[PDB]
Structures are given as structure tokens and as C-alpha cells.
Amino acid sequence: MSEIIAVANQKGGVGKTTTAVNLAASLAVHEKKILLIDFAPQANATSSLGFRRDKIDYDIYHVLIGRKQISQVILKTQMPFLDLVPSNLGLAGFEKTFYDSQDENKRGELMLKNALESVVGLYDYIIIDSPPALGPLTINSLSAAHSVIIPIQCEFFALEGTKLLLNTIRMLQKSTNPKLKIRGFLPTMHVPQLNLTKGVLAELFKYFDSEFFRDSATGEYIMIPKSVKLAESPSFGKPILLYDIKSNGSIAYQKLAQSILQG
Amino acid sequence: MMSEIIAVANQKGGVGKTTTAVNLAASLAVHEKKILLIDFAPQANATSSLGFRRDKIDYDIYHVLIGRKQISQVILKTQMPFLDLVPSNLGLAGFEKTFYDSQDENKRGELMLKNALESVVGLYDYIIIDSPPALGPLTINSLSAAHSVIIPIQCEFFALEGTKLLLNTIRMLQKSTNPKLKIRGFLPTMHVPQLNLTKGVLAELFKYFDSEFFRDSATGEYIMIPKSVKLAESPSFGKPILLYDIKSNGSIAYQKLAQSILQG
Ligand SMILES: Nc1ncnc2c1ncn2[C@@H]1O[C@H](COP(=O)(O)OP(=O)(O)OP(=O)(O)O)[C@@H](O)[C@H]1O
Ligand SMILES: Nc1ncnc2c1ncn2[C@@H]1O[C@H](COP(=O)(O)OP(=O)(O)OP(=O)(O)O)[C@@H](O)[C@H]1O
Ligand SMILES: [Mg+2]
Ligand SMILES: [Mg+2]
């Protein structure tokens, strides 16, 4: 039975896709069976794994509207234990479908959850990459999930942003997903010596210190460092472990996976 | 006054749309041009960048769009006399539902921002719109209202696939709802010239798009916003960078950007 993990932040460019891709790969290297769901219309996760937009046939949007079952759209990747549900531009049509269903039921929030029900016994982990909004796509991600990883870029808008995302999660924990947990807060693109980084982290630590990911071996906080090689990796269509497994970016995501595998 | 309405748009997240909208607006304001900044994103980062608390704001752009308030009822004065703000709130996430209601009955909704701006176009020299990271109803409304669009581009790998897709949306709107819409220009942001990935991405962008890039007409140079510690720090003080550090490289770059706009 899958643990379904959403990677969510409504702030743009905070490392959601990079985290979802590289965590899924770092778990798959252990020969745990992993499904990555690209839940964003811009489809950066799909492209990160080497799949160009013009080569995608049927995608997650076709599953949500019922043209395809989810087993029909699953792609195998270069890693034998990592599978991908690709996305495409057509997933921007989901918003229309969501509000239409809310005139035919109350159930639009559960459309991804219902789509995943035939694969939950086939994978150890299902990782969902969310778009930068609190709209219907992210609401579907969080309603399908057992847990949520929040990548945090520590710059100024993270302060107001983290508080809002947590309020969204609390409201879902009342209504549509009572079992939903914060898996953890993960600092991404992290540059420890910056004063802005220090100020933002200190503020988040006051309220949130128990939510930050820690190394299961050393007890240290797990943070993903700003890394030239991490930014280069989707241009090769590979997660960073498949080529440079000794870079600091690769080592950090591997620490994250080890922390997830403990439970 | 006849406003030039400029949208700042990219569906990629975190590429500097808000930083560009706020700092271009301030850089135009110091030339005694009357500027209206519209925060068109539900996350409301432009509102926070100018020193306002989102939770303290009663009525915003969402209420204007659905017709509950006139735009002149929600306009706030900022610290700079020539720069006014229409704030945003999380309630702007409700607009999508309103849009798809309007598309269902009369097939409208693209023009809701344009219609809302009609009473202020004679009152401002420039109206700058900060868009959210999506190609949805809010970005469709900002591009349908605009004379021109500035596309901030972070030059990392997803810029290549993403730029073409935004251009497609722009072309489709140029055929239907907004024929006058032009690209004002592509603006490289968070730019670190020495990186191999930066060089590779820019070479490919110049290959397809060279004529679209912002230029300093005095030197012929490409205008790029450098990665700057101070640019990231400035919204934490509720100031644009020219009020925070006017001599910093990011300040100098946004003033060059404003010169390019002002020269025509
Ligand atoms: N640790 C890191 N070091 C350096 N660059 C990074 C790191 N993490 C991500 N990046 C780069 O930063 C950019 C933004 O990251 P990414 O696209 O993963 O964020 P996102 O939150 O998924 O964005 P969006 O909101 O558009 O979905 C990408 O170009 C990526 O290659
Ligand atoms: N040239 C720069 N140098 C350093 N930091 C920058 C620069 N431009 C923007 N930033 C910082 O990078 C982050 C992303 O910028 P910003 O929020 O303006 O992007 P955006 O495209 O509006 O994001 P979103 O997609 O979330 O709306 C912000 O924290 C900002 O303070
Ligand atoms: Mg992403
Ligand atoms: Mg923004």
C-alpha cells in the first residue's frame, strides 16, 4: 500500500519539481517501486526525466476526464523502479472540469484520489508534483495525499506564504482529508551565509522547528544546497544521482529519502 | 494622459515577475510619470513588497473585477507620490469560478480586467500588471488588457520550453481578444553570466528570439537584471530597490529598463 506524498508550495520557483523528481529517484535507487505524478500543466517534472512535450501521447488530464485509466498512461523511465504519469498543457483544462463537477456533486477535490485508487497497491510511494497555486490542482494533490512535503526557499515571501499554505492544510484536515500530515519542511536552494536566509530560517524555526526534516543518521537538519549541478540536471533529462552521485545536491536528496524510508 | 498598460507575465514560477513589476513601476515613478501597479496574483507578493499587510486590506482587485467596487475605491497611495497600488488578496483565487461562469453563459470573461481599468486609463501614464505563474484566467485577463507584455526569464533549463508556450498564448490572444498586444520585451532576471547553463540557455534564446530582448539604445547592449542580494532583501523592508539601495547593480538595471520603456 502506497504512501502518497504531495510536494506543495503556492510560491513559484521554490524547488517543488526538483524535489519531487530527485526524491522519487533517491527512493527508487533502493528498489522501492515509485510512481511520480506530474500534476502541473507546465510539466517540468515530465521534461526533467527526458520526456519532451511533443512526445507525450496521453497524460494525467486524460485520466481525470475518463478517456484513459491511469495504467494506460504510465511511462517507464531510465530507472527500473521509477515510473511517471506525465502531464501536458491540456491539464490547464482541469479547472473547468473541477467547477463543472461542483455543479454535479460536491466531489471535485477527490478526482486525483479516485484516479489513483487502482495503483495504490502497486507502488511503495506515489510522489505528486504540484503547481504554484492554491487552486483545484493543488487541492486535488493535497486531498489525495497521506502526507505533504513543503519545499521552502528562504527568502522574504516564504514567511507570509508558509502560514497561508498551513492554513490550507488545516482546513483540509477538518473537511476532506482528516489523515493528512505534514511530512516535513525542506529548505531548498539553500545558501547558509546570507543574512536574508538566516533571518527567514530563524523566523520559521520559532513556530515550525519540529516540522523540519532531520538526518536519521546524524540528527542534522536536511537542507538542499544551492547547486549548479542540480540546475543542470534536467537539461540532461536525468535525476542527479544517475550521473553525479557524489555532488552535494545528490547527497542531500539521498539523505531526504533515507529519512522518508524510516517512516 | 493615455496609459500604456504593460503586463508582466510568465507561467514559470519564481522568475522575478513581482520583482520586475514593483521595480519597473518605481523606476518610472521617479521621472514624474503617474504609475498604477496592479497586483494581479492571489499570493499578493507585490502588495507585500510595497509595505502593505494583506490581512489588513478590506477591498481589492477581486471586488473590482466582479463589479462590487469601482477601481478608484480600492487604489492605495504608496510611499512614492507618483506610484499608486491596486492591492490583491487570497480572495482573488475566487476569480476562476467567476470566469468559468461567464464563459458558460455568454462566452466572455477575458475582458473583465480591461473593463475595470477603463475609468483610470486617462489618469495614469503607465499601468503595470503583475501576473500569477499560470496561463489561466488571471493571466488571460492581464494579457487581454495590455498594450504590451514584459516576459522576465530566468535562464535555466525550463525557460526554453516555457517561453514558446507563452508566445503561443500571446499569438492566440492577438488573433482574438486583443489585436494590439505586443511583446515589449524579454528580460533576463537573476542573471549570473559565468554559469555554463546560463550561457547555453541564452544562446538558444538568442537563436530563436534575439529581436525580442530588451536593449539599451545608447549602447546596443542587452538589458539583464543581475542576481543581487539587495534585490531579494528589499521587499522585506517594504521598499523597491531604488529606495533601499539606489546605487546597487539591480537598481541600476531596473532604471535602464525604465529608460527603455520611456524612450518608446
Ligand atoms: N538546490 C538547487 N540549486 C540550484 N538550482 C535549483 C535547485 N533547486 C531547483 N533549482 C532550479 O531552480 C529553478 C526552479 O526550481 P523548480 O522548477 O524545481 O521549482 P518549482 O517550485 O517546481 O517551480 P514552479 O513553481 O514553476 O513549478 C529550476 O530552474 C531548477 O533547475
Ligand atoms: N535579480 C534578483 N536577484 C536576487 N533575488 C531576486 C532577483 N529577482 C527576484 N529575486 C528574489 O527571487 C524570488 C522570486 O522572485 P519573484 O517573487 O519576484 O518572482 P515571481 O515570478 O513573481 O514569483 P511567483 O511565480 O511566485 O509570482 C523572490 O524571493 C525575490 O525576492
Ligand atoms: Mg514545478
Ligand atoms: Mg510574483
Numbering used by the authors:
A (entry chain B): 2 to 264
B (entry chain A): 1 to 264
Give verbatim excerpts from the published study on this entry:
The ParABS system, composed of ParA (an ATPase), ParB (a DNA binding protein), and parS (a centromere-like DNA), regulates bacterial chromosome partition. In Helicobacter pylori, ParA and ParB homologs are encoded as HpSoj and HpSpo0J (HpParA and HpParB), respectively. ParA forms as a dimer in the ATP-bound state that can bind to nsDNA through a continuous basic binding patch formed by arginine/lysine residues. The partition complex interacts with the nucleoid-bound ParA forming the nucleoprotein ParA–ParB–DNA complex, known as the nucleoid–adaptor complex (NAC).
A key residue, aspartic acid (D41 in HpParA), coordinates the water nucleophile (WNu) and initiates ATP hydrolysis, playing a significant role in ParA ATP-hydrolysis. To investigate the relationship between WNu and ATP hydrolysis, we solved the crystal structure of HpParAD41A in complex with ATP, HpParAD41A-ATP. The overall structure of the HpParAD41A is similar to that of the HpParA, with a root mean square deviation (r.m.s.d.) of 0.4 Å (in Cα). In the ATP binding pocket, the electron density map of the γ-phosphate of ATP clearly revealed a complete and unhydrolyzed ATP molecule. We can clearly observe the WNu located and coordinated between the γ-phosphate and Asp41 in the wild type, while the WNu cannot be observed in the HpParAD41A-ATP. This suggests that Asp41 likely captures the essential WNu and plays a crucial role in initiating ATP hydrolysis. As a result, HpParAD41A exhibits reduced ATP hydrolysis activity and functions as a deficient mutant in ATP hydrolysis. HpParAD41A is an ATP hydrolysis deficient mutant with lower ATP hydrolysis (0.4 ± 0.2 mol Pi released/mole HpParAD41A·hour−1) compared to HpParA wild type (1.0 ± 0.3 moles Pi released/mole HpParA·hour−1). We observed that HpParAD41A has a tendency to prolong the ATP-bound state when in dimer form.
